[PDB]
Each structure stands twice: as C-alpha cells, then as structure tokens.
C-alpha cells in the first residue's frame, strides 16, 4: 500500500523557493491519473568530453632512484654513491652475515634441499636470455620463496646488486605479506631490508637497491601511473589461479615486454597446461620444475563410508553407486545432501586415520570459514578431540598471521596436527607434516548479479583440477591418502576448470585502471587478454561508469573519474566521499567507506547482536551509525595507550587488528583526497551523539543511501522486508535492526538502505540503515513516477506525498550531481561556494533530518 509521507507546509514551500533560486523544471503535473510523468531530471551540468592503444613505459633500475617512493635519492650517502660501490657493500655485508651467524646457515642448509634448488643455475640462464619464461612446477617445490631469492643472490654474488629491483606480485593480500615475512626471515631479516611488501592500505618498503617488493596487482597497477621506473625483474607468481587482476596485468606486461625487451618478466604456475600462457607471450621457454611426489591412495564418499561404517541421521549423485559397494553403504550415502557437507563423516574419518597407525597431519578443505568453525566446535565438543591427542587448527585469510604460521610448526609427539584450510593450502602454502588429505570438494567464489545488485557466497563443486591439486598434498612427505567427500558418479560430472574470475566479476575497476593509465578503450584492451570477458560484463562496466560520470559521452575520463581511479575502493562509495567532502562530513564517509574493505569489528559469532553491542547503535537503527560510534569510543580508549586500548576491545568484544587496518585505510583515503586538492578542513574528525539532535550524521546517513544503492527495502513486520525486486527478504541476524527476541521492533520509518542484499536459502539484507522517506526519493533512488498524489519510486514501492515535494527532491539529486561534476573540477571551490549553492546544500541538510520526515527518534 502507497506510505503516507508527513512533511510540513514550510519544508514545501523552501523546498520549492531553493527550486526557484536554482532556476530549475518542476515537471509539473498529470491531466489524467492514469498517464504518470518521469520526475527525473536529466544531467543539470557534464563535463566539456575530450578526444579518443598507450605502453606503460620502461626503465631499469638506478642507483640514485628508489623505485618504492618513486622519488630521487638526495639525502645520504646513496645519492652519488656509484653503482660498484653499492654493490661491493651489499656484497661484503652478505658473505660476512652468512660466515657469523649460525642460525641463518642452518636455514640456508633448509633452503638447499627444496627440489627447486636443483634448477637454480638452469632457471637462471633462461631468464637472463629471454625477455619472460614460465617456471612451471609443483606446489611445494620452493618456486616463491627461492626463485626471487635466486635472481637477487645471482646479482649480489656476480657485484651487480645495484642492477637488481624486483616486483613479485601476489593474487592475495595474505601471501604478498606471508612471503615477503617468510623471505625476509629466510635472509635473516625483517621485511624492511632486502625484503619488503605493498597490499591495500599497508606496506612496509624495501631498501632502495637488490631488493624485493611481494604485492598484490591492485597494488602494482595504482602505482603504474608513472611507469615501471627502476625495476630489472617483474615476477607475476600462481599465474594458475586466473586471479582477475593478474590476468589484466598479463595484458599490461606482454605490451611491456614487446617495447621494452630489457625487461624480464618471470611468470610461476603450478602443474596445469601452461601452453595458453606460452603461446600469449611469444612462445616463451618453459622451465620444468620437480621433485620427490609420492603415491597418494584416492577415495570418494561411497569408500569413506565403507571403510569408516558410517550411517547418517542438478540431479543427486548420492543415489549412484555401483554393484562392488554393500547396501548400507548405498542406503547411508543416499540420505547425505550433496549441498551439506557431512561433518560426522569427517569426525569418522579423522578416528578410521588413528587405526592406520602411521603419523602425520591432516589437511582439511573446506570452502569458507563458515564450515571450518562449524567443523571445529563438533571437533571441540568431543573430548577425543582435546589437546592430549589433536591440534586442530584453523587456516582462513581472516586470522592474524600469528595463528596463520602456527599451522607450519611441528607438534608433540602422540599429538596429530588438523588443518581446517580454504584453498590457500591447495596451491599457495605448502604444510610439510601432511599425509592425509579430507576434500570437501567444493569451492567458495563471489558471484554478483547486477541486475538484481545480488551477492551470493556460493558453494560451488570443485574442478577435477582442484581435486587432482588437493590430493597432491598428501604426497610429500610419504605414501599418502585423499578422502574425496563427493560420490564417484558427482566426480564424473564436474568440470575440469573452474570459470576463470575475468568471466564472473564486475570490470568497473579494471576499466578506470585502463583509462587512468591512457592505454585505449575498455572494451579493446580486454578484448587483448588471454580469455577475454563476456561482452555483457563489459557493457555493464561501462554503463556503471557513465551513470557515476566518471566517462564523458565519449568514454573518456572526466576529472570525477580520475580521483575514484585513484581511490582504492567501490567507485560509488568513491564518489559518496566526495561528496561528504563537499558537505564537510568526509572524515565520517572515509570511516563507512574504510570499513567496506575488512570484517566486521564485531566479535558476534553469528548470533544476534549483545547489550554491548547494540548500544554502540544509539536510536538510529543503523549498523553504520553503530560503527561510526564504535570508531569514536575506540579512537578515545586509545589516548590511554597500548594496553587500555587492548582492554576496550577485550571488554566491548571488537577485533582491535580490524580497527587499526580500518583507520591507517581511511587515513590513506584522506590522503588521496587532500592530494586532488580537498581541504583539510571538510576531512576533520567531528564528534557527534548518536542519540540528540546531529546534523554531520543525518548527512553521513543521506550520503549513505547514495554509496550502498540501490540497496532500499521495506520492513513488512517481524524480520520480514520487501526488496527492490518486490521480493521477500529477511533482516540478517548481525543487524541491530534484527530483534533480539520476540519483542518487534517499532520503527519510525520502514525504509532501510544496506551493504549487501546476499542469497543463501533465502534474500538477506546485512549492514541495515534506516532513512527517512525523503532520503529514499533524495539519494536511494533512480525513477520515480507521479500521478498526483502518489509517487511509484523504481516501480517497486508507492508514497503518498505532493507531487511538488517529489519533483523538487528530485532537482535537488540533479542540482547536487551538477555540483559534484564542477566540484571535482576544481575541489578547493568547497571552501568559497557561490550563495544559490551553499542554499541547495542547507536544503539537503534539512530534508536529511528525521524531523524533516515527521520522525523523532528520542520518542520510541
Ligand atoms: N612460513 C613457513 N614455515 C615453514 N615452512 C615454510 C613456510 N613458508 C614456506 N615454507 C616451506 O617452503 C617450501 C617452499 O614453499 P614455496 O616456495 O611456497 O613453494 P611453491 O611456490 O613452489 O609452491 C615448502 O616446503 C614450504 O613448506
Ligand atoms: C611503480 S614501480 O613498479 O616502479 N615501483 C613500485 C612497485 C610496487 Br608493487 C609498489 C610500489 N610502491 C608502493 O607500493 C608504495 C609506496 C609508498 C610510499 C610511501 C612513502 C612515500 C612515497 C611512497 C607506500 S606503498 C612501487
Ligand atoms: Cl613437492
Ligand atoms: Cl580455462
Ligand atoms: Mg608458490
């Protein structure tokens, strides 16, 4: 039914006056109810479009130039210091190194033995003769760790050291940085010397000179601006994984490498056919790497419930199984849903594994970390599964890198080590105690539909690849065993690749990285890559980028467009901060859009919120107001130091490690903004209450219903919404909007704009905001219809208000659009705006306000 809207005659008459100061179309009304008129304005204001394949260009490294600032040595002795000099030192300081310390000889003698040792002279002719090879190999044979170590020593040893700057790029954050660690402690250091590394919002540089940065690709890419200046060696490792980024990048270095033959691109895969790679890049050399595998014993689920005498509380291949297997075996596994994984079965299996009466560990896949606390609590009810006897222990990129390396250390005797892993462990890491391998068979992959802005964490059937690779890891060591969890007829019918992520991921940030650094059109430049994206992906990324007016009618880049290219986030919350930049709230809008990059804070367990933390809220009904709270609380207890900042987390139940990411990830935003020329002064940190009357935060909400749209939905009753699509959804358990019990919420309004609309069984909202209506027709929506005294907004919800009201909300989105596109044209024109201007921003203010809506919300 049509919402009847309550706003008062003065908001409709000031509404209207700002309409008439702005010398702006109030799309005046229908004759017949029955023909009802768009509202929307058009563009109000677009920026002057500009004329229409660019090189990222070359050059080597140098002694007075350090590659990771990108700036001259000037202060210090490097700054004249010659080449040989540099080197001579380098040298001397190494050799000296390895003859005093023991426990760094010990280490080497560790390195010395990886199968990948045994190629170090070849692997080094054919990078020195060919512009890029290919190292293939299996996982574990020391291609990451030893390959750029190998490259570096070559120089150092041979008095080059000076010559050689190496990029190793990463496919995830928690490998750029557990390799440059692992490196770092195999030359005896720690990152911050020969070693070093670059991921979103964190590094730590390298020395200038014989050193190696570990980075993901977003990050080399962001850098690329100027070039790649003073680099001999471009290492691109796990080429394999099809990693979006990387696969871009690979279009980025063949045109390098075509230009700019000096340079040396090194590319490191597993054991896949590298013959696609190879043919792209000029039928490069393949050197292959290997050595001691041991057999590894396959089963599937038919002989895992055999052998264990398990019994249980697309088509469905549970119910295939052949003549050679009994009939409780049949029976048992006809009753396992193949969309479950059955954690019994695994407890069976880890019991079958004691019997066999031969040590080593047990590596777990399992696809989230979902199913891995899942796995882990049933372990940990049981008593068989204490510490007397088990380790069981987690391996998810979520879990401080403490916890990460512990999974490498080596347990007491009579104790066997469980490794609950996501496909890290499958190509990436390799855990030297592991004879036995238990194989969820499946995948987690983020999978967006745009048409419906639907998330959905899939659990997806691993590839015949995937299971291949994950029985590998049980041969390292010994004769081995792989406990595959999916019948042998599912095994039949799964694909021998998983989809690639350039076929299934959104290319709105590739495309502004391809027009930031000038190398051609969106839709050329990724019809160049080594398995190009679907047409429709492409559409859709240019269609995302035009709307935001980061392309001009040509598709060119407008001047919006170059700051969200240089702001790493969402363009949408991109462009949300420039205009909290504009209203003075930008601190705030860095915050909401920092935390878009990491975990919730919230230690909840994936239960329903606490006293605690539900009082972070105040009366907003906000999962972000209650963020922004937490970050002000946080950010206080810290002027008590270190240990009164621990103790805040411990007692509030936060992840400390996740607040401090977030706030060095909004400081680096600020930065970015105050170096396109934002003033100091609309990034301040404000205090606000979250409970009286606050202004800054009604404006930080209406500047959030323009970042997360179009994520709006209506509360029916109960944890019951509606959807943009006229679809039921429910409210997520992690909202301070979902009730805690059986007492219903009172809300003051029924709209609510979120972070994610997610499918699992059912349509999730999760990171819930109530808005006024007025904030619904201001910022959290597109079209919207009157006939006259209703108003029908993205033809999946009605308001009773004024046509008027409507119309004139509708001009102030447009008025303020044409304000963005001047401003970012020239950003210190926010301090000294034009009268008509700062009017249509008091107006926006206003209308932001509960009170504005008819709503008070320190009345219940
Ligand atoms: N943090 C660590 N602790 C212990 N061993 C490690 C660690 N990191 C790597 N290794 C060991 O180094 C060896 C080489 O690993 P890596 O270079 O990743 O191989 P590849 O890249 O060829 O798969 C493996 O035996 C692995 O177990
Ligand atoms: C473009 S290239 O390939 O030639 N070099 C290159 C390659 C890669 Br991967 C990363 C980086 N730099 C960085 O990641 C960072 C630099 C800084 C910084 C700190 C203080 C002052 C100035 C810069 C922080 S992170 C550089
Ligand atoms: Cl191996
Ligand atoms: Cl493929
Ligand atoms: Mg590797």
Redesign the pocket.
């Known amino acids: 039914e049509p919402y009847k809207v309550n706003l008062s005659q003065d908001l409709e008459h000031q509404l209207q006056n700002v309409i008439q100061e702005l010398n702006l179309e109030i799309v005046p009304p229908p004759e017949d109810p029955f023909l009802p008129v768009v509202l929307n304005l058009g563009k109000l204001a677009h920026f002057e479009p500009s004329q229409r394949i660019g090189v990222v260009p070359w050059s080597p490294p140098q002694s007075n130039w350090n590659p990771w600032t990108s700036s001259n040595i000037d202060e210090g002795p490097l700054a004249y210091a010659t080449p040989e000099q540099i080197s001579m030192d380098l040298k001397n300081e190494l050799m000296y190194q390895l003859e005093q310390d023991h426990d760094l000889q010990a280490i080497l003698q560790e390195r010395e033995l990886?199968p990948?040792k045994k190629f170090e002279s070849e692997i080094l002719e054919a990078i020195s003769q060919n512009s890029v090879i290919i190292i293939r190999?299996a996982?574990?044979?020391?291609?990451?760790?030893?390959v750029p170590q190998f490259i570096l020593d070559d120089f150092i040893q041979n008095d080059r050291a000076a010559e050689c700057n190496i990029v190793v790029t990463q496919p995830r954050r928690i490998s750029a940085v557990?390799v440059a660690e692992?490196v770092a402690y195999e030359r005896g250091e720690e990152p911050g010397k020969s070693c070093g590394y670059s991921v979103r919002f964190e590094s730590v540089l390298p020395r200038p000179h014989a050193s190696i940065m570990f980075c993901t690709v977003g990050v080399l890419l962001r850098k690329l601006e100027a070039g790649i200046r003073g680099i001999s060696h471009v290492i691109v490792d796990e080429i394999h994984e099809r990693d979006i980024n990387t696969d871009f990048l690979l279009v980025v270095l063949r045109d390098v490498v075509q230009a700019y033959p000096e340079v040396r691109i090194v590319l490191m895969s597993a054991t896949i056919d590298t013959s696609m790679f190879c043919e792209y890049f000029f039928n490069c050399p393949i050197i292959e790497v290997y050595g001691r595998t041991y057999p590894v014993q396959e089963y599937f689920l038919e002989d895992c419930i055999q052998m264990t005498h398990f019994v249980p509380p697309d088509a469905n291949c549970n119910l295939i199984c052949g003549d050679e297997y009994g009939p409780e075996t049949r029976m048992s596994m006809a009753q396992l849903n193949e969309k479950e994984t059955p954690f019994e079965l695994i407890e069976a299996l880890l019991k079958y594994i004691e019997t066999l009466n031969v040590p080593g560990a047990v590596l777990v896949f399992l696809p989230g970390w979902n199913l891995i606390y899942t796995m882990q609590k049933h372990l940990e009810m049981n008593p068989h599964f204490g510490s007397h006897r088990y380790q069981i222990l987690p391996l998810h990129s979520q879990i401080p890198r403490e916890e990460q390396?512990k999974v490498?250390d080596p347990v007491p005797s009579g104790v066997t080590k469980v490794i609950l892993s996501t496909n890290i462990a499958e190509?990436s890491?390799?855990?030297?105690d592991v004879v036995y391998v238990i194989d969820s068979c499946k995948q987690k992959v983020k999978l967006f539909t745009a048409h419906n802005n639907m998330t959905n964490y899939a659990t997806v059937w691993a590839s015949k690849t995937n299971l291949e690779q994950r029985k590998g890891r049980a041969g390292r060591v010994r004769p081995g065993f792989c406990f595959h969890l999916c019948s042998r007829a599912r095994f039949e019918r799964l694909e021998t690749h998983m989809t690639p992520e350039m076929f299934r991921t959104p290319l709105h940030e590739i495309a502004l990285s391809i027009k930031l650094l000038r190398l051609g059109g969106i839709g050329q430049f990724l019809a160049k890559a080594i398995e190009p994206p679907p047409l429709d992906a492409v559409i859709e990324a240019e269609h995302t980028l035009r709307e935001l007016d980061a392309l001009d009618a040509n598709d060119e880049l407008t001047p919006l467009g170059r700051i969200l290219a240089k702001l790493p986030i969402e363009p949408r919350f991109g462009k949300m901060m420039i205009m909290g930049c504009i209203f003075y709230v930008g601190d705030a809008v860095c915050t909401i859009s920092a935390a878009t990059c990491f975990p919730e804070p919230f230690i909840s367990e994936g239960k329903r919120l606490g006293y605690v933390h539900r009082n972070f809220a105040g009366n907003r009904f906000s999962d972000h107001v209650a963020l922004l709270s937490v970050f002000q609380a946080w950010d206080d207890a810290r002027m008590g130091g270190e240990e009164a900042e621990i103790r805040f987390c411990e007692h509030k139940r936060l992840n400390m490690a996740t607040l401090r990411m977030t706030w060095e990830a909004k400081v680096q935003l600020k930065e970015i903004l105050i170096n396109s020329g934002f003033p100091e002064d609309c990034l301040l940190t404000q205090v606000f209450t979250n409970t009286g009357p606050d202004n800054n935060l009604d404006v930080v909400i209406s500047l959030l219903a323009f970042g997360v749209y179009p994520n709006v939905c209506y509360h029916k009753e109960k944890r019951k919404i509606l959807t943009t699509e006229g679809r039921n959804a429910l409210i997520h358990k992690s909202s301070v909007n979902c009730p805690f019990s059986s007492q219903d919420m009172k809300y003051p309004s029924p709209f609510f704009v979120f972070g994610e609309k997610i499918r699992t069984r059912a349509i999730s909202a999760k990171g819930m905001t109530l808005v006024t209506p007025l904030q619904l027709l201001l910022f959290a929506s597109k079209k919207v219809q009157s006939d006259g005294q209703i108003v029908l907004v993205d033809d999946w919800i009605r308001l009773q208000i004024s046509h008027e009201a409507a119309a004139c909300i509708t001009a102030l989105r447009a008025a303020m659009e044409a304000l963005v596109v001047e401003v970012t044209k020239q950003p210190n024109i926010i301090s000294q705006l034009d009268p008509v201007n700062e009017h249509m921003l008091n107006m926006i203010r206003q209308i932001s306000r509960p009170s504005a809506a008819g709503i008070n919300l320190m009345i219940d």
């Open positions: 990886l990948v190999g996982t574990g044979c020391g291609k990451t760790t030893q557990s692992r390396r490498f190509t890491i390799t855990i030297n």
